[PDB]
Ligand binder design. Structure first.
Ligand SMILES: Nc1nc2c(ncn2[C@@H]2O[C@H](COP(=O)(O)OP(=O)(O)O)[C@@H](O)[C@H]2O)c(=O)[nH]1
Length: 356
């Protein structure tokens, strides 16, 4: 796993590119040894300048288009968060402005080299190089705002959540203090890590537990699935709903004791709002805090739960009571997807091990 944009280079501003290009053209012209006639020598120098400016600009710009992943090549989850962080449509257009600039400059180069190559009026030969420089600087200034934006989008994109996008992932939801992280830590092997996540205070915990030779990713959702989604901006809402493309199973934890600081009825409302936003992912309801919970509420919960067609698992994340029942259930739910993912990995590769 990694950040898809780590390879995206710093984008030079229109001025920096202009200066780099003119400077390089200046250097190449003085150390060039023209051929014969006085006018022929100036003409071959001016041609060299036009080509050097054209190449230096096109090479730097083209590097941006080549080293930045095409958004369509990214997993849906990242496409969603990329859009949240810098706006997908704006990104595509900025990039297209770069491609446009590369294209017009190539055309201008071919156009001006011909005019110069075909001239015999020193006055004109000079004026033509001067015009080309003028036009190159102008084309680059036309996209300067786009370049500046691409450089800022570059810095912002460094905060993409660093998580595994291939292996099955379990997403833990529920109100604050219901035991989400306690459960994630009881579930994972190595210590949890922290992934950055748009619209969260301190990010989210990311863990992993291995069964056989298969890996299962576990994440919790503080600041994301611990409060009414409706009471949210359409953007942070998009950031939250992006989890649809990462999660393969959602574990929803209820705290019947209400020690979390939320009445059972409020936890049920949240469960229903979350259960509805993720209709295409399987759910595993866990009733936590059984070690301190009152039988009274637990009856209402199981009742309510079973009425939604779900068979809950009673547990105590703190004391380990039932954790193995959860791990077991995770494995039973996700092992097939894990095998399918594994196969498809051997597939994709076999298809390029025979490159040609
Ligand atoms: N009595 C009891 N307390 C628990 C249990 N699980 C977690 N807690 C405590 O409840 C509080 C919140 O748990 P936490 O994992 O931080 O909740 P999150 O905000 O949903 O991640 C903590 O102080 C945990 O120690 C449990 O099974 N029984």
């Amino acid at each position: 796993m990694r950040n898809p944009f780590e390879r995206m280079p710093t984008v030079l501003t229109a001025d920096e590119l202009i200066d780099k290009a003119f400077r390089r053209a200046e250097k190449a012209a003085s150390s060039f040894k023209p051929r014969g006639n006085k006018v022929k020598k100036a003409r071959l120098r001016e041609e060299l300048r036009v080509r050097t400016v054209s190449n230096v600009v096109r090479d730097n710009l083209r590097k941006v288009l080549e080293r930045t992943p095409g958004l369509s090549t990214l997993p849906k989850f990242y496409q969603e968060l990329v859009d949240v962080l810098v706006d997908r449509d704006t990104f595509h257009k900025a990039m297209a402005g770069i491609d446009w600039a590369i294209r017009i400059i190539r055309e201008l180069e071919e156009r001006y080299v011909e005019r110069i190559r075909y001239s015999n009026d020193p006055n004109e030969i000079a004026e033509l190089r001067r015009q080309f420089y003028g036009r190159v600087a102008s084309v680059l200034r036309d996209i300067d705002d786009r370049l500046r934006y691409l450089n800022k989008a570059r810095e912002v994109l460094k905060d993409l959540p660093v998580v595994d996008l291939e292996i099955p992932t379990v997403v833990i939801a529920g109100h604050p203090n219901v035991g989400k992280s306690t459960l994630l830590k009881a579930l994972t092997t190595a210590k949890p890590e922290i992934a950055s996540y748009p619209f969260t205070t301190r990010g989210i915990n990311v863990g992993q537990f291995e069964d056989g030779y298969f890996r299962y990713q576990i994440i919790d959702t503080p600041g994301l699935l611990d409060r009414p989604i409706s009471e949210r901006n359409e953007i942070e809402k998009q950031a939250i709903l992006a989890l649809r493309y990462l999660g393969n199973l959602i574990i929803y934890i209820f705290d019947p004791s209400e020690h979390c600081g939320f009445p059972l009825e409020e936890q049920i409302h949240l469960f229903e709002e979350v259960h509805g936003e993720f209709k295409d992912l399987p759910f595993l309801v866990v009733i936590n805090k059984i070690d301190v919970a009152d039988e009274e509420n637990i009856k209402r919960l199981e009742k309510f739960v079973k009425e939604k067609g779900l068979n809950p698992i009673k547990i105590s994340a703190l004391k380990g009571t039932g954790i193995d029942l959860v791990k077991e259930e995770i494995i039973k739910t996700l092992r097939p997807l894990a095998e399918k993912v594994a196969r498809e990995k051997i597939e994709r590769e076999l298809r390029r091990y025979r490159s040609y």
